[PDB]
């Protein structure tokens with residue numbers, strides 16, 4: 001056993017190599033060690049307890065998108081700057097259009113240059129309408145008007161793109177709250193970059209506490225990062241990662257498989 | 268507004284050294300230094316405490332600052348922009364998707380124009396939706412002319428070629444080249460980067476004078492494979508460390524410079540035109556540790 005205390009500090013190094021947030025690391029090592037003490041072959045057995053704990057922490061099995069029973073399903077996307085929100089918007093429409101669902105995007109980024117035009121172009125590629133507003137109608141009001149347009153056209157799914165914002169930017173987080181309040185969304189998905197480092201746990205927690213999320217989308221998995229940011233999402237927020245992106249093409253949206261992520265993190 | 272490192276070091280006396288350095292180790296990991304650099308820093312501090320060289324909380328913090336400043340200074344060249352002597356100088360901006368290439372280029376153009384430098388922009392991102400439109404908005408903001416591809420089938424290398432040619436004929440001082448985001452794991456896009464460097468070099472000997480790698484400050488230890496591959500493939504002459512106005516610290520940039528010798532040359536500290544600062548190592552290390 002406490003010969004296994006030795007490789008136990010070795011998987012701490014490996015998890016920290018993999019960008020896993022230090023408080024998540026600590027609870028993982030202690031949770032695994034306590035099971036190692038009671039569980040009582042011994043080498044294959046520690047590998048199994050570790051792989052199994054990663055899979056459990058990250059949701060066990062796939063979490064499906066949940067849809068509104070009686071109206072349009074409303075999906076709000078949010079996240080830090082550059083993580084891939086606008087691309088994921090159109091990817092998501094491409095993904096849900098393939099399930100027979102009719103879609104509509106909402107151009108809610110009025111700050112970044114050419115952001116609306118970026119979303120409008122991607123929408124034309126996947127063949128979904130994009131709702132846009134004039135200059136000087138704020139994001140909370142384009143949420144209101146875009147949602148009304150969606151209900152009038154009997155759309156199955158509404159997907160709202162938002163500008164990137166710092167989770168510590170009180171004004172912009174307050175704006176995100178207002179967007180959510182007027183959208184009344186079925187899903188609020190945090191978009192998280194798979195290369196994200198140690199801030200990932202604090203990032204999810206702030207978004208979940210100030211906005212309240214229902215899940216997450218992990219992007220840029222065609223990179224070569226180990227993706228330890230994935231381990232924090234369900235552990236600090238209770239909500240699963242539901243989808244991953246692995247490329248720039250509109251089709252590169254897939255379900256999140258806790259099992260596959262586990263092997264990638266210890267890869 | 269809690270200064271983590273100030274507060275854990277307030278506990279230090281000789282008998283508390285291990286308990287304090289354990290806390291210091293967690294504080295550095297949380298700043299994205301990584302375990303390898305953190306162990307080296309902490310072990311060197313423990314030896315200098317135990318030999319009686321470091322005698323107070325502030326001497327320890329000064330020695331902590333000193334060791335990171337030493338790693339940042341393990342470069343072979345200067346942190347200033349090194350434009351050539353030929354007109355125009357050529358600067359390419361490169362890096363992974365989403366890091367801040369196009370915004371940083373606009374902010375750098377703003378700085379050059381404040382100095383009287385005549386700047387021409389090249390919209391070398393011919394792939395992503397609205398990439399030209401976005402760079403055009405920055406051109407109008409900063410008072411630069413811009414070269415934009417006519418067709419949708421345009422190649423990055425052809426656009427930068429025409430732009431560098433136009434900059435030479437019209438006496439521009441600097442041609443700033445945007446490029447589409449690419450993952451260092453994508454062989455054919457890294458090849459396309461080699462074609463741009465070769466194409467620009469055929470018009471002005473020595474171009475490109477600068478190839479600046481943009482590193483997202485939110486990124487953890489993946490910063491290092493990024494800098495390795497990009498540098499191996501085209502040669503990076505400086506780093507741009509973006510998004511430091513957030514809660515990420517960018518601590519992984521220390522090991523990039525330490526392993527590769529690429530100077531950090533600018534930091535991004537927001538989204539407005541002015542939010543690009545020339546790298547000051549003293550300011551950076553003071554900021555990262557409080």
Ligand SMILES: Nc1nc2c(ncn2[C@@H]2O[C@H](COP(=O)(O)OP(=O)(O)CP(=O)(O)O)[C@@H](O)[C@H]2O)c(=O)[nH]1
Nearest residue numbers: 081082083084085086087164220245246247364365
């Ligand atoms: N290799 C790869 N690139 C991706 C992936 N997802 C998005 N990208 C690329 O990331 C870059 C940023 O994408 P974008 O959708 O504009 O991000 P954003 O979060 O909307 C930027 P802002 O916060 O300003 O709105 C783009 O070049 C995009 O093609 C991915 O999964 N893999």
Ligand SMILES: Nc1nc2c(ncn2[C@@H]2O[C@H](COP(=O)(O)OP(=O)(O)CP(=O)(O)O)[C@@H](O)[C@H]2O)c(=O)[nH]1
Nearest residue numbers: 081082364365366367368369370448510535536537
């Ligand atoms: N808070 C903050 N945001 C930044 C900073 N630098 C860039 N951004 C923001 O990140 C997002 C992406 O910026 P952009 O310049 O388009 O990145 P890029 O590398 O060109 C994305 P692509 O790979 O598609 O070309 C933008 O919203 C931008 O305003 C920064 O220093 N601080």
Ligand SMILES: [Mg+2]
Nearest residue numbers: 086109115163
């Ligand atoms: Mg946008």
Ligand SMILES: [Mg+2]
Nearest residue numbers: 368369392398
């Ligand atoms: Mg760009």
